[PDB]
């Protein structure tokens, strides 16, 4: 049996920053989801469109594993219909999103006493994002009416999360994996057992 590499997605040593979230395609494999919905390691596990008791035996053309690191307090923004700094400028899910949002506390992996500033998020943008878009430009953001000229009310659009082991839970890092599912006119390639 050719099993889908959910292990590799969830056990990755490094996750992308939310401003530049990663995407991996899962196809032409057997998707065993029993390893995801039967564990207590996740703090968040919520599916939209398809029930966890049904997706286990449904066939799809693609499963997209989108992954990133955000603050625990911002986990609630990773949902259809949501708004906020992450939902609007970093990672937008469509109102008709089908798939599962899975997240867990990674305070023992992604934070340091001296401050782990290697995880960035977009703080400013001229407008919000299209669902599943990605914007990794670093063009200086002009907040006011004064031209930035590439360099007051002009900001480097990204900011770091000061992730530290002593932060309270809402300020601890969370690893988020969003499995977006779709069925196209194309023949399905990803079936469960």
């Amino acid at each position, epitope marked *: 049996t050719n099993l889908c590499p959910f292990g590799e997605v969830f056990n990755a040593t490094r996750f992308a920053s939310v401003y530049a979230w990663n995407r991996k395609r899962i196809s032409n494999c057997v998707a065993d989801y029993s390893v995801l*919905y*039967n*564990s*207590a*390691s*996740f*703090s*968040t*596990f*919520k599916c939209y469109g398809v*029930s*966890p*008791t049904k997706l286990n035996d449904l066939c799809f053309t693609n499963v997209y594993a989108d992954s990133f690191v955000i603050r625990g307090d911002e*986990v*609630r923004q990773i*949902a259809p219909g*949501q708004t906020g700094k992450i939902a609007d400028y970093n990672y937008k899910l469509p109102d008709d999103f089908t798939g599962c949002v899975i*997240a*867990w*506390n990674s305070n023992n992996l992604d934070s340091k006493v001296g401050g782990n500033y290697n995880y960035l998020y977009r703080l400013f943008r001229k407008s919000n994002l299209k669902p599943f878009e990605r914007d990794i430009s670093t063009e200086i953001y002009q907040a006011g009416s004064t031209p930035c000229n590439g360099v007051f009310n002009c900001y480097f659009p990204l900011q770091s999360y000061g992730f530290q082991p002593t932060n309270g839970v809402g300020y601890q890092p969370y690893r988020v994996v969003v499995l977006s599912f779709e069925l196209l006119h194309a023949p399905a390639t990803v079936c469960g057992p």
Partner: antibody
Framework: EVQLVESGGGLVQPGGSLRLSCAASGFTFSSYWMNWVRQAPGKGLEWVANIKQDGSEKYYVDSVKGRFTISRDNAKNSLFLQMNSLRAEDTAVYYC????????????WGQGTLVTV | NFMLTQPHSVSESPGKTVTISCTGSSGSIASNYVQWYQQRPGSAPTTVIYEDNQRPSGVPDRFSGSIDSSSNSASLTISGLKTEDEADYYCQSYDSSNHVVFGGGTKLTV
């Protein structure tokens, strides 16, 4: 048609022990999680213990750690709960319940075993 | 620790509607699924609503519900109360900090 049949309750002295069990029929244990849910007289429900399909992993409410042990025999279609060092706090009816997946619903409940201290 | 709370006493005349809330505390109710149970006095609780807003076969369509992320709360509503709908209703959700959390329970009369 599924049924959960509890037994092994009754009175128990403070500081003692009793083994509760819950026989099942109509379904296979290999496909379900089993849980115990406690209901003190006149109060709402609270969760006590959880065992997964293979018996390889167990969870408990923190308030019973070191006092309760959950186990299951897939061949005998019987769930067990061994509870030691009971206190007055522990008087309750104990329901066993079937859960399809960990974070999902408890879609079938037994009638409940009365345990008093 | 994450916990759910509920109104103790809820009631309304038959034929009218009722809302039974469940609010989160020191955690997000919307991060997991919310279940609702109905326990008639004298017997075991059964599922009425599960996975936020749906219901198992055997449950009439007068029982519905939703989760309001912005209020960190969830609720079920009953329309067209029947005198049959006399029970203690409970909300339930899962957390990693504390595995299964049941709400206090709402005593509903008609």
């Amino acid at each position: 048609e599924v049924q959960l049949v509890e037994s092994g309750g009754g009175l128990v002295q403070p500081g003692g022990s009793l083994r509760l069990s819950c026989a099942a029929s109509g379904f296979t244990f290999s496909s379900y999680w089993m849980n115990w849910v406690r209901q003190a007289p006149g109060k709402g429900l609270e969760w006590v213990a959880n065992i997964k399909q293979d018996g390889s992993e167990k969870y408990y409410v923190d308030s019973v750690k070191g006092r309760f042990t959950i186990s299951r025999d897939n061949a005998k279609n019987s769930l067990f709960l061994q509870m030691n060092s009971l206190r007055a706090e522990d008087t309750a009816v104990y329901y066993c319940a079937r859960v399809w997946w960990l974070r999902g619903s408890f879609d079938y409940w037994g009638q409940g075993t009365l345990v008093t201290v | 620790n994450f916990m759910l709370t509920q109104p103790h006493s809820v009631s309304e005349s038959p034929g009218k509607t009722v809302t039974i809330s469940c609010t989160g505390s020191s955690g997000s109710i919307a991060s997991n699924y919310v279940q609702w149970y109905q326990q008639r006095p004298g017997s075991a609780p059964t599922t009425v609503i599960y996975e936020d807003n749906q219901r198992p076969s055997g449950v009439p369509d007068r029982f519905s519900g939703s989760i309001d992320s912005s209020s960190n709360s969830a609720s079920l509503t009953i329309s067209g109360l029947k005198t049959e709908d006399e029970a203690d209703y409970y909300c339930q959700s899962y957390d990693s900090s504390n595995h299964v959390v049941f709400g206090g329970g709402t005593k509903l009369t008609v």
